[PDB]
Amino acid sequence: RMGHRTLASTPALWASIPCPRSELRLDLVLPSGQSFRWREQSPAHWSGVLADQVWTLTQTEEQLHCTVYRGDKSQASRPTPDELEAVRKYFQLDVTLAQLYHHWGSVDSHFQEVAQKFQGVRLLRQDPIECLFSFICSSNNNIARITGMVERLCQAFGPRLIQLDDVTYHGFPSLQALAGPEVEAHLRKLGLGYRARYVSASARAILEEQGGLAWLQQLRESSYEEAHKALCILPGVGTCVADKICLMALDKPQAVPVNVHMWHIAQRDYSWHPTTSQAKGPSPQTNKELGNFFRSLWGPYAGWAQAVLFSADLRQ
DNA sequence: GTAGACCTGGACGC
DNA sequence: GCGTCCAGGTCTAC
Ligand SMILES: [Ca+2]
Ligand SMILES: [Ca+2]
């Protein structure tokens, strides 16, 4: 009845999705800087907001186990087939990770070695507004801090959903909320630092200059090139943040976010250096060259392979 | 095209 | 003991 559910404590309220560990490891996907919305509130059980409801997820060897908290309006019950489809879409489970790992390991002997220890790193398919603003909060920052900033943002500006134990979950804020008066100041007091202004300015820029939510949503059907360029108009969004949004919310599997983590990987594990620029270190030209190097290496799902090596780089 | 400032807070050095 | 370096970079200025 009370508290976050576990598979043992409320057996009747879980449904499953067939899903081998080769296809998904929650512990390597959820806390690794794709989504900041999930916490392991009981060992091996991950809770967070997915498609505007709270869920807890946990896995056995062949199954992803899902439970959904709706309110108070009904009465607790197992997830419905439609609700389970939402989970499948968020994890993009139609994409067969074992196939991609095989392809990348065949063209890249170092990937093949890492892959063996880091199975099941796949990419979530995120809502565009939640992805956009969360990655705006991510620049020049670390995942533990970013996670708290996002939580406090949703608490202050998003709709309350439900409370489990002492944890209240909220939906991601709308553009309207984020574009409202005095939002920057309130975000400063929530510890967002200089990105407080970027969040307010992009929410306004989007509603009042770009065409609203439709402008962002329609980038899903635009080309990578067009989507990336569109996104860099926004305050706090440079090439790397834009790439993260392209990859993680706008269905551009070839997008490769290039930052110092990716330079470390490139130099340590590929002995890479820039060819077509004079600069020895990160710059707009050298970062652009590095992203192209990863696409040439891995092919059209290069940003997915980048997510495997990035998740591995965090486990130091 | 280069270079350094910048909110915040944990790790680590002397 | 603050002092500095760093973390899913972007913005601003010769
Ligand atoms: Ca950084
Ligand atoms: Ca920008």
Domains delineated in chain A: 1-91 (3.30.310.40), 95-115+256-314 (1.10.1670.10), 127-252 (1.10.340.30)
Q: How far is the CA of A205 from the C1' of B12 (A)?
A: 41
Ion ligand 2: residues, Cβ under 5 Å: A 232, 237
Q: How far is the CA of A120 from the C1' of C13 (A)?
A: 45
Query: Are A196 and A184 in contact, with CB atoms under 8 Å apart?
Result: yes
Chain breaks in chain A (C to N over 2.5 A) after: none
C-alpha to C-alpha distance for A223 and A215, rounded to whole angstroms = 14
**Residue bearing tokens 């690794």:** A32
Chain A span 128-187 residues with beta carbon within 7 Å of strand B: 140-142, 144-145
Counting ligands in written order, which one lies closest to the CA of residue A259?
1
Q: How far is the CA of A45 from the C1' of C10 (A)?
A: 36
Q: How far is the CA of A244 from the C1' of C10 (A)?
A: 14
The technique is X-ray
C-alpha to C-alpha distance for A147 and A37, rounded to whole angstroms = 7
Query: Are A244 and A231 in contact, with CB atoms under 8 Å apart?
Result: no
**Residue A202, nucleotide of least CA–C1' distance:** C10
Chain A span 287-306 residues with beta carbon within 7 Å of strand C: 306
Question: At residue A39, what are phi and psi to the nearest 5 degrees?
Answer: -135, 145
What amino acid occupies position A35?
Answer: S
Element (H, E) at A172: none
Question: DSSP code of A79?
Answer: P
Strands (E), chain A: 15-18, 39-42, 45-50, 53-59, 63-69, 160-164, 167-170
Taking the CA atoms of chain A, what radius of gyration do you get in angstroms?
20
Secondary structure of A175-226 in HEC code, one letter for each residue: HHHHCCCCHHHHHHHCCCCCHHHHHHHHHHHHHHHHCCHHHHHHHHCCCHHH
C-alpha to C-alpha distance for A252 and A304, rounded to whole angstroms = 10
Q: Is the CB of A195 under 7 A from strand B?
A: yes
Q: Which nucleotides of strand C lie within 7 A of protein CB? A: 6-11
Coil, helix or strand at residue A66: strand
Coil, helix or strand at residue A107: helix
Counting ligands in written order, which one lies closest to the CA of residue A142?
1
Query: Are A33 and A310 in contact, with CB atoms under 8 Å apart?
Result: yes
- d(CA A211, ligand 2 centre) in Å: 17
C-alpha to C-alpha distance for A77 and A235, rounded to whole angstroms = 43
Chain A span 49-88 residues with beta carbon within 7 Å of strand B: none
Counting ligands in written order, which one lies closest to the CA of residue A139?
1
**Residue A247, nucleotide of least CA–C1' distance:** C8
Question: Sheet of A63-69: strands edge to edge?
Answer: A15-18, A63-69, A53-59, A45-50, A39-42
- d(CA A133, ligand 2 centre) in Å: 13
Ion ligand 1: residues, Cβ under 5 Å: A 140
Dihedral (Cα; A186, A188, A191, A196), 10-degree rounding: 100
